[PDB]
Amino acid sequence: VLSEGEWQLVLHVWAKVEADVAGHGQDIHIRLFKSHPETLEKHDRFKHLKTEAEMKASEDLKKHGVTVLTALGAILKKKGHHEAELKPLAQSHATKHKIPIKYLEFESEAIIHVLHSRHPGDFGADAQGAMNKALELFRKDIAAKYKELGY
């Protein structure tokens, strides 16, 4: 739904994520789990990590963040043509992990906050708008697949 110009801002900012994917992943998950503690309960792997120092010390959580941001980066680089990338993600998050669509909204907010905190200069108003639109499109298409799956 984005313009080419907006996609360029999305991908330009994502290149900075890729310069420290693991660090971005940790910051995003710490923000998600501290702001929305109920999400922490859906991560059986991590629900025992109840302090910020405890999540930061978890190499398992650090590895998961890379997995997550690697999949998200692959989706964003498709500039909306991400049917095949979203299919297995919707399938697992709807029917295996049982993640409400609202939690993807919480994670999207956390991504935006971390990008702004690490890259306040490059993640200005226009890049923030483009990245919000890209994540909104991701959530819309995931929600449509949830419905196809019966969830």
Ligand code: HEM
């Ligand atoms: C922000 C967008 C998100 C992306 C891109 C993403 C991506 C992924 C990927 C690639 C996996 C591993 C493969 C798979 O099982 O499908 C995974 C696993 C998982 N995700 Fe997500 N995810 C997101 C949001 C969330 C949210 C919000 C929750 C719940 C709070 C969640 C909970 C889980 C759980 C429980 C697993 C299984 C992990 C395990 O125990 O090994 N995800 N995700």
Ligand code: NA
């Ligand atoms: Na579970």
